[PDB]
Automatic annotation (TrEMBL), chain A:
Domain of life: Bacteria
Full-length numbering of the shown residues: 901 to 950 of 1050
Organism (species): Algoriphagus machipongonensis
Protein name, UniProt field: Uncharacterized protein
From TrEMBL, chain E:
Native species: Algoriphagus machipongonensis
Included range, full protein: 3 to 551 of 933
Protein name, UniProt field: Uncharacterized protein
């Protein structure tokens, strides 16, 4: 990038240094089963989406 | 823990079915309240003893299978297939010693 | 025009036969792995001549001595401030440094 | 083989060919504005997601 | 590029619209499925079957024209592609905004061999007690040490020029040329302060060199001398397009920067020809030892050219001040030997060799000025929409041909022929439309101006009584009126015109989606016309819009 910018400009390249909030919620009104659709499974799906 | 029970088809011991679980980490073979050498699992109830059905047996390593409808005569569908009529796979060896 | 294909790179770990002590692995040796949707096999080639023998990594250990306070400022043993920390891992590649 | 392979690249699809040609005709290979910088890097460096 | 023998394939089978027999079989299959209750006789004397075969023939003709190559289908009467495409000379080059671009920009001014771009540091001092600023440090009088500040300016230039003339100063005509081009082509928030000739540093080289007993010394001297000068201060050369291609560059790269009228300049050479910071014996020796005929360098030394050059260090490496170019001091010398005997050289012979070696370089820079562009394939032009009526494919017995029908057969048969002509026009008007649609591809995708309609038709005039068959012959005199009357509303022009425009805009990676609602705060229903006009204008003006940012 610095080769293509301008004689006068240098850019810096960094890592995002991530930081983030997380969800909690009211229990689902339905589930396939206590195990098959355990709250833990829902948590895993939520984690994947994020 | 929540990830240790996979399924429970018999929650109140009224019908036949499958219970499936993983052996938990920290399960212990060396104990004194029950004989050593076995992993031990407990089931419990606080109700009168007859609110559940009587048992015939408990078996490990159970597998379910279903009849394939092909161009033949399903004579065995009038009355259930007798017990102990099935002993082997189509391909006899797949690293399995016996099927009951 | 369109751009062409670039080949991928891998590392392989080799273990020699019980009855030999050393061997020479020449450049261009073919390796086999996997097939595409046509059923054709993938082929990889060794990039450099190398020498294989029976040498294995057995143990990994580590130390670190971190110093905050210059020795000349120690006037009494019970200093108000920590002067440094010195730690060890008997098994460097375990979770807690001890085998977990 | 303890680890996955790396550094390979498949031939361009029609969709990528059109995408690449179309962007060069707009940014002229110069890094001036926001779009320019962001698209020059995603085209040049194949293992950057965002 | 020789002529080849020409032949025709023997497997005439494709199972598509160019395959007559295939089409005929499908025709019959459809007939049975739809009408076998009433039409069962499929013998060859049947008028029904006769009509089917004629139509199948007409379909093959249409398919054959659709396959005509693009070079011809969108050709202009006068040749060229003016309203269809932008050429590489116009759409790939970029305004110069980088340091290398500026060097390429100025290096093409005749008389200039090289240029370097440096940044000015103008300093401003400030009083933090009383906010005040000046270029003088007098701004700090009577202040404390913590009340002082300095800032440097961020966008100013100085241009260092190396010329062919070897004079002391730049000609004022060069200063005007450099300032003119800079200002004409500049970045936002940047400026040029000064243009000046590059400063130099003189270096001495002295040596004793033994050469082969059968060697041309005057030539060896000319060659060594040129090679050392090139080491100290290299310069780029111009190339033809053919040469850039031979080097392995592609189109995207060849046309990456500003377009240059004098030939192409290779970026690698340009980067290499930077002002040198260090000179050393390990390179100078290699230059001499590599000249054919040189056997031994018996003595060699470098040194800063200076006065009172008495006993001094070897100076194995000489460093150069930050804004100077090194140059031989002209107090240099090489003593040539054969065996143990010294030989003498003549100045006129050396000058002649040096001149020839360098003059041949000028010849190539000049040749590079002609080959500046690639070829574009050229087609022909031939009214691709020409159509002939299917009525001419029937026999005389039917009575629908140019020679008519003999009077002795009576009126009733003549009347029936009229009825058939009417029926067949339902098939011809459709085919004529498809041919007509090919003739408009150039307009539909035009960068200058598209059409108002998206579907088209034609009058059919190779039928002898069309003036009687049609209720109002007026329409046959103007295909635009005929289109409005026969297709009419079925042509949803606003939606279709937008789809075409959006596609063309997308080809340049642009996007006009926001006009869909922003214009509704200015206009009501009239926005549909306004927006299409603006999109066409955008495409026409695109060459400058995307470049001069």
């Amino acid at each position: 990038v610095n080769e293509l910018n301008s004689f006068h400009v240098q850019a810096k390249v960094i890592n995002p240094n991530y930081e983030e909030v997380k969800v909690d919620v009211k229990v689902k009104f339905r589930e396939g089963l206590d195990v098959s659709f355990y709250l833990t499974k829902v948590k895993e799906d939520i984690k994947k989406f994020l | 823990q929540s990830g240790e029970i996979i399924q429970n088809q018999t929650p109140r011991f009224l019908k036949s079915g499958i219970f499936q679980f993983s052996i938990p980490k920290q399960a212990n073979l060396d104990n004194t309240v029950l004989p050593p050498g076995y992993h031990w699992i407990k089931a419990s109830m606080v109700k009168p003893f007859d609110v559940v059905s009587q048992l015939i047996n408990i078996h490990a390593q159970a597998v379910e299978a279903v009849f394939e409808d092909q161009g033949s005569s399903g004579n065995h569908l009038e009355k259930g297939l007798p017990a102990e009529t099935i002993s082997k796979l189509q391909e006899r060896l797949s690293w399995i010693k016996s099927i009951q | 025009e369109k751009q062409a294909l670039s080949p991928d790179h891998v590392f392989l770990i080799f273990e020699l036969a019980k009855n030999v002590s050393q061997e020479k692995l020449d450049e261009g040796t073919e390796v086999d792995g996997g097939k595409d949707d046509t059923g054709k096999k993938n082929t990889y080639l060794t990039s450099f001549e190398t020498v294989l023998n029976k040498t294995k990594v057995g143990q990994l250990k580590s130390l670190y001595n971190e110093i905050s306070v210059e020795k000349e400022e120690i006037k009494e043993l019970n200093t108000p401030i920590s002067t440094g920390t010195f730690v060890m891992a008997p098994m460097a590649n375990s979770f807690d440094g001890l085998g977990e | 083989q303890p680890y996955p392979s790396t550094k390979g690249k498949a031939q361009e699809s029609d969709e990528d060919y059109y995408r690449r040609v179309s962007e060069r005709l707009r940014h002229k290979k110069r890094a001036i504005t926001l779009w320019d910088y962001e698209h020059l890097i995603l085209q040049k460096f194949p293992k950057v997601y965002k | 590029t020789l002529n080849k023998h020409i032949s025709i394939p023997k497997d005439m089978s494709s199972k598509d619209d160019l395959d007559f027999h295939f089409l005929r079989e499908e025709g019959i299959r459809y007939i049975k499925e739809l009408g076998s209750n009433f039409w069962t006789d499929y013998n060859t004397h049947d008028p029904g079957i006769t009509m089917l075969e004629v139509l199948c023939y007409a379909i093959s003709d249409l398919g054959n024209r659709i396959n005509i190559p693009i070079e011809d289908l969108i050709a202009n009467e006068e040749g060229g592609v003016k309203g269809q495409f932008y050429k590489v000379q116009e759409i790939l080059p970029s305004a110069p905004t980088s340091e290398l671009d500026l060097r390429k920009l100025f290096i093409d001014i005749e008389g200039i061999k090289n240029c370097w771009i440096k940044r000015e540091r103008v300093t401003v001092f400030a009083d933090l007690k009383n906010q005040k600023l000046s270029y003088e440090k007098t701004i700090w009088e009577d202040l404390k040490e913590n009340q002082k500040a300095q800032f440097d300016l961020k966008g100013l230039y100085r241009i260092l020029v190396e010329t062919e003339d070897a004079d002391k100063v730049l000609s004022e005509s060069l200063e005007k040329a450099v300032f003119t081009k800079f200002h004409a082509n500049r970045n936002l928030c940047e400026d040029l302060i000064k243009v000046e000739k590059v400063a130099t540093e003189p270096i001495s080289v002295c040596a004793n060199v033994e050469v082969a007993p059968e060697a041309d010394e005057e030539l060896i001297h000319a060659q060594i001398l040129i090679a050392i000068e090139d080491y100290l201060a290299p310069s780029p050369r111009h190339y033809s397009l053919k040469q850039m291609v031979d080097k392995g560059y592609t189109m995207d790269e060849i046309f990456e920067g500003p377009f240059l009228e004098n030939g192409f300049i290779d970026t690698v050479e340009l980067k290499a020809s930077e002002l040198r910071k260090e000179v050393r014996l390990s390179d100078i020796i290699n230059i001499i030892m590599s000249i054919d005929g040189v056997k031994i360098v018996k003595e060699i030394t470098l040194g800063n050219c200076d006065e009172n050059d008495g006993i001094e260090n070897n100076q194995w490496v000489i460093c150069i001040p930050e804004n100077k170019k090194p140059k031989l001091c002209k107090k240099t010398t090489i003593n040539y030997f054969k065996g143990i005997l010294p030989i003498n050289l003549n100045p006129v012979r050396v000058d002649n060799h040096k001149s020839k070696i360098l003059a041949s370089r000028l010849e190539n820079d000049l040749k590079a000025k002609d080959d500046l562009e690639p070829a574009i394939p050229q087609g022909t032009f031939a009214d691709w929409g020409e159509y002939s009526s299917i009525q001419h494919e029937f026999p005389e017995t039917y009575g629908i041909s140019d020679i008519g029908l003999p009077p002795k057969l009576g009126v009733k048969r003549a009347v029936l022929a009229r009825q058939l002509k009417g029926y067949l026009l339902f098939f011809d008007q459709i085919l004529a439309s498809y041919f007509e649609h090919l003739s408009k591809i150039k307009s539909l995708l035009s960068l200058d101006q598209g059409p108002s309609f998206t579907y088209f038709t034609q009058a059919i005039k190779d039928i002898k009584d069309v003036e009687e068959l049609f209720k109002d012959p007026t329409l046959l005199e103007n295909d635009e009126e005929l289109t409005k009357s026969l297709i009419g509303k079925l042509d949803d022009t606003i939606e279709r015109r937008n789809q075409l425009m959006d596609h063309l805009i997308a080809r340049f990676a642009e996007n006009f989606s926001s006009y869909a609602f922003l214009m509704k705060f200015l206009y009501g229903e009239s926005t549909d016309e306004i927006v299409l006009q603006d999109k066409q204008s955008f495409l026409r003006e695109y060459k400058e819009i995307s470049r001069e940012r």
